[PDB]
């Protein structure tokens, strides 16, 4: 199973400079250039946060 697919996993929501969001496994180190925004939580909770807050999928550098 893929870490990002596992439902038993604790997850994090990361955001880069372009406003793009990524799920991240809680055990993994946060990569450089990515910032955490939503505490360790269930897969679904994180997905909910993304569907709510990542409204414009366009990179920010293009207005």
């Amino acid at each position: 199973t893929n870490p990002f697919d596992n439902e038993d996993g604790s997850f994090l929501v990361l955001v880069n400079g372009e406003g793009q969001h990524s799920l991240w496994p809680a055990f993994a180190e946060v990569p450089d250039g990515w910032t955490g925004v939503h505490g360790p939580a269930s897969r679904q909770d994180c997905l909910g946060y993304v569907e709510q807050n990542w409204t414009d999928l366009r990179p920010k550098s293009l207005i």
């Binding site: 990002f4 880069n16 990524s22 055990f27 990569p31 569907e51």
Partner: protein, 364 residues
């Protein structure tokens, strides 16, 4: 940028053939003028930069005109296949947010209710500024709209000589065929479009005789010819298969008949696009994926696997799409952060791969 490269070949060789579609033959100049005129029509009917235009046309020759016209307006192209049911077609136009649908007389029936229609069959000058991040495409797999930036398309095209010829089955909503039609035009070559039906060994032998040096074939046709006559592939510098990775036996048969031919398969989907070349494996022939100057093979903990270990393939590069339209959550789980590259993303293919002792990336 396809438009910038195409313009060069319109300047250097305007009278060269660009498309050979059945009875229809278009030079680089003709294709440019026809697209410029249709582009002006799109601008009149309200097409602005960043807008999305749905295109549903039978013939490939028309398909290219519409494409360039959409890009000339600065808009993005949503490929719609006439075969799709109206449930699909209506949804794809709704999800993309396309205001206008471009069609032919034959396909006009498919235009959903409430969509402004322009028919290619039935002068103002604009000068638009576009950037590589702008969307060129929205490609649909309920179907998921993949937002492809102009830059991603540029990577795929980024070698052919002018007047060289590529034999291609009719472009399809499928990711493979839709992008391939560009490759010949960026180099000054010509697209030669196969009549409907499986490519046969003789058609392949006839095409190479006409000057086709490259062929983009369905997995089924490749296997058919590989069994029928491996020797028919002779004359081609590169033969490329799309769809299911062809059985290794067929590739080995074709190689014995044509030692010079390069066999590749376009396994990748629209989100992340990979061109893979068959090579003789150390043990045999196997698909090999270029690392580039990137790809990662990662375990379940997202830590890089050792050589000879199989892991899931993650792809990072300029070819990656922005994400899935109206699916932020799905984009976030598929387009995960890349530990190697700051502020970058890697796309999980869902496909297994492994590293050879030589360091070549191997599909699995």
């Amino acid at each position: 940028m396809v438009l910038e490269l195409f313009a060069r070949h319109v300047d250097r060789t305007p009278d060269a053939v660009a498309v050979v579609d059945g009875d229809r033959v278009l030079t680089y100049r003709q294709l440019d003028e026809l697209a410029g005129r249709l582009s002006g029509r799109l601008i009149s009917r309200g097409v602005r930069r960043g807008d999305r235009v749905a295109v549903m046309m039978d013939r490939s020759a028309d398909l290219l005109v519409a494409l360039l016209a959409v890009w000339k307006a600065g808009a993005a192209y949503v490929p719609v296949d006439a075969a799709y049911p109206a449930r699909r077609v209506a949804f794809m136009v709704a999800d993309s947010g396309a205001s206008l649908m471009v069609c032919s007389v034959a396909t006009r029936d498919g235009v959903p209710e409430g969509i402004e229609s322009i028919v290619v069959d039935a002068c103002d000058a604009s000068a638009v500024t576009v950037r590589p991040g702008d969307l060129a495409y929205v490609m649909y797999t309920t179907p998921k709209g993949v937002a492809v930036p102009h830059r991603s398309l540029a990577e795929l095209v980024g070698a052919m000589e002018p007047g060289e010829a590529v034999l291609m089955h009719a472009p399809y909503a499928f990711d493979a065929s839709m992008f391939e039609i560009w490759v010949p035009l960026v180099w000054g070559a010509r697209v030669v479009i196969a009549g409907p039906g499986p490519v046969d060994a003789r058609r392949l032998r006839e095409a190479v005789a006409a000057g086709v040096t490259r062929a983009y074939l369905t997995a089924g046709s490749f296997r058919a010819v590989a069994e029928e006559s491996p020797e028919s592939f002779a004359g081609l510098r590169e033969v490329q298969t799309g769809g299911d990775l062809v059985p290794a036996h067929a590739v080995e048969r074709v190689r014995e008949a044509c030692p010079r031919a390069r066999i590749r398969h376009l396994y990748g989907p629209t989100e992340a696009t990979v061109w893979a070349t068959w090579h003789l494996l150390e043990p045999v022939m196997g698909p090999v994926l270029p690392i580039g100057r990137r790809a990662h093979v990662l375990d379940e903990s997202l830590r890089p696997v050792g050589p000879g270990v199989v892991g899931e393939l993650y792809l990072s590069g300029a070819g990656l799409a922005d994400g899935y339209l109206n699916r932020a959550g799905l984009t976030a789980e598929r387009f995960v952060a890349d530990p190697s590259a700051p502020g970058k993303r890697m796309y999980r293919t869902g496909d297994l791969a492994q590293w050879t002792a030589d360091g070549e990336l191997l599909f699995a």
